Every structure is written in structure tokens, then in C-alpha cells.
Amino acid sequence: ENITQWNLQDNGTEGIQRAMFQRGVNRSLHGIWPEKICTGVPSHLATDTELKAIHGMMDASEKTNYTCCRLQRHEWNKHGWCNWYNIEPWILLMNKTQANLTEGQPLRECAVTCRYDRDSDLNVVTQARDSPTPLTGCKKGKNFSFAGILVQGPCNFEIAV
Numbered sequence: 001e002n003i004t005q006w007n008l009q010d011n012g013t014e015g016i017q018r019a020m021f022q023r024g025v026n027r028s029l030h031g032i033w034p035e036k037i038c039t040g041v042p043s044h045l046a047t048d049t050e051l052k053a054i055h056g057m058m059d060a061s062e063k064t065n066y067t068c069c070r071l072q073r074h075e076w077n078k079h080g081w082c083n084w085y086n087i088e089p090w091i092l093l094m095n096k097t098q099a100n101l102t103e104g105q106p107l108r109e110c111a112v113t114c115r116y117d118r119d120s121d122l123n124v125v126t127q128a129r130d131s132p133t134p135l136t137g138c139k140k141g142k143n144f145s146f147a148g149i150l151v152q153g154p155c156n157f158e159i160a161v
């Protein structure tokens with residue numbers, strides 16, 4: 001039901017992807033998205049101390065030099081509070097999800113966004129998720145590179161019949 005999405009290293013893409021490449025980080029959690037989007041005043045303001053407890057998750061913002069906590073806070077505000085009700089189980093889930101992502105190639109990994117690299121003739125995956133979705137910037141007929149891992153299709157598991 002919830003979509004889990006993350007960023008992948010790519011020196012060819014400006015921002016978080018380049019920062020991950022430079023720091024030797026392969027996968028950085030973006031969010032865990034239930035169907036319901038939060039609106040209005042959050043029930044708790046996420047502190048830097050709470051958000052720093054999501055170990056390994058890099059901020060997408062250049063303002064924090066891709067560390068913490070703009071992306072982390074935006075995720076709690078837009079997807080967290082109204083669905084998890086309390087910050088503690090949300091931090092634990094996000095931390096465990098990132099800990100799992102840091103181990104290597106997840107059991108379910110599907111391309112979201114690509115940067116086609118002419119030199120290697122590969123779709124370099126910049127964002128991926130745990131379920132298939134329509135692709136962005138991925139050139140048809142080309143193999144996929146998920147933080148170095150070569151996959152023939154957009155997912156590391158068969159989707160179709």
C-alpha cells in the first residue's frame with residue numbers, strides 16, 4: 001500500500017545524486033508514502049535531533065549540504081504526522097528502511113527517474129521505488145544501472161505475465 005522511494009548515486013546528476021557519489025553512498029531514502037497526504041498544522045514539530053535519528057538518510061537540499069533535515073521534516077509534515085500520529089514509530093520505520101537500503105540492492109527495486117548516459121549506453125537510475133511506475137528520462141531498449149548494478153528491465157523482478 002505505502003510507496004517506498006529512494007535516491008541513488010549518479011555523478012552525472014547535479015544535487016543529492018552527485019553528493020551521494022562523492023560520499024560513497026549508494027541509496028538514500030526519500031520517503032514512505034501512504035495514500036493520505038497531510039494538510040494543515042502538524043500534530044508535532046519534527047526536531048533536528050529526532051530527524052538525525054534516521055541514520056544514513058541524506059537531505060535533497062544543497063542548503064544543508066545534503067545532510068539533514070529539510071527533506072526529513074518535509075516528509076514528516078506532508079506524509080508522516082496524519083498517518084503515523086506519533087514521531088517515534090515513524091522515525092523507527094524510516095531508520096529501519098534506510099538501514100535496509102544501506103545493505104545493498106533491495107528485494108524490490110524499480111526505476112522511477114533515469115539519466116540516459118550516452119558513453120555507457122545505460123539508463124542510470126537516479127530514483128527508485130519498491131513497486132513499478134511510469135518512467136521519467138529512461139530511454140527504451142537500454143539496460144538499467146541501479147547504483148552500479150546492471151538490470152535488463154526497469155525492475156529487479158518480473159512484473160508482467
Ligand SMILES: *[C@@H]1O[C@H](CO)[C@@H](O[C@@H]2O[C@H](CO)[C@@H](O[C@@H]3O[C@H](CO[C@@H]4O[C@H](CO)[C@@H](O)[C@H](O)[C@@H]4O)[C@@H](O)[C@H](O[C@H]4O[C@H](CO)[C@@H](O)[C@H](O)[C@@H]4O)[C@@H]3O)[C@H](O)[C@H]2NC(C)=O)[C@H](O)[C@H]1NC(C)=O
Nearest residue numbers: 009010011012013014015017018019020021022023115119
Ligand atoms: C563527476 O561529474 C562532474 C560534472 O559532470 C565532473 O566534473 C566535470 O569534469 C570536467 C573534467 O575535468 C570539468 O570540465 C572542465 O571544465 C572547465 C570549465 O568549465 C566550466 O568551469 C566551471 C567552473 O567555472 C565548472 O564548474 C563548470 O562545469 C563549467 O562548465 C574547462 O576549462 C575544462 O577544459 C579544460 O580541460 C579539458 C579536459 O582536460 C581540456 O581539453 C580543455 O581544453 C581545457 O584545458 C574542462 O572541460 C567540468 O567543469 C566538471 N563539471 C562540474 C560541474 O564540476 C567530474 O569529472 C565527474 N567525476 C568523475 C568521473 O569522477
Ligand SMILES: *[C@@H]1O[C@H](CO)[C@@H](O[C@@H]2O[C@H](CO)[C@@H](O[C@@H]3O[C@H](CO[C@@H]4O[C@H](CO)[C@@H](O)[C@H](O)[C@@H]4O)[C@@H](O)[C@H](O[C@H]4O[C@H](CO)[C@@H](O)[C@H](O)[C@@H]4O)[C@@H]3O)[C@H](O)[C@H]2NC(C)=O)[C@H](O)[C@H]1NC(C)=O
Nearest residue numbers: 001002032033034035082083084085086087088089090093
Ligand atoms: C503504511 O503506512 C501506514 C500509515 O498510513 C502505517 O500505519 C500506521 O502505523 C503506525 C504504526 O507504526 C500506527 O501508529 C500507531 O497508531 C496508534 C493509534 O491507532 C488508532 O487505530 C487506527 C488504525 O488501526 C488509526 O487509524 C486510528 O486513527 C487510531 O489513532 C497510536 O496509539 C500508536 O502510538 C502508541 O505507540 C507509540 C510508540 O509506537 C507511542 O509513541 C504512543 O504514545 C502510543 O502509546 C502509534 O502511533 C498507525 O495507526 C498506522 N496508521 C494507519 C492510518 O493505519 C503502516 O505501518 C505502513 N506500513 C508499511 C508496511 O510501511
Ligand SMILES: Nc1ccn([C@@H]2O[C@H](COP(=O)(O)O)[C@@H](O)[C@H]2O)c(=O)n1
Nearest residue numbers: 003005030031033034035074075078079
Ligand atoms: N505518491 C507520491 C508522492 C511523491 N512522489 C514524488 O516525490 C516528489 C516529492 O513528492 P513529496 O514532496 O510529496 O515528497 C514528487 O514530485 C514526485 O516526484 C510520487 O511520485 N508519488
Ligand SMILES: *[C@@H]1O[C@H](CO)[C@@H](O)[C@H](O)[C@H]1NC(C)=O
Nearest residue numbers: 092093094096097098100107
Ligand atoms: C528490513 O528487512 C528485513 C529483512 O528483509 C525485514 O524483516 C523488515 O521488514 C525490513 N524493514 C523495513 C522497514 O522495510
Ligand SMILES: *[C@@H]1O[C@H](CO)[C@@H](O)[C@H](O)[C@H]1NC(C)=O
Nearest residue numbers: 053055056092095096098099
Ligand atoms: C537506526 O538504524 C541503525 C542502523 O543503521 C541502528 O542500529 C540504530 O541504532 C537505529 N536508530 C534508532 C533511532 O533506532
Ligand SMILES: *[C@@H]1O[C@H](CO)[C@@H](O)[C@H](O)[C@H]1NC(C)=O
Nearest residue numbers: 024025026102104147148149
Ligand atoms: C555500492 O554499490 C556497488 C554495486 O553493488 C558496490 O560494489 C559497492 O560496494 C557499494 N558501496 C557501498 C558503500 O555499499
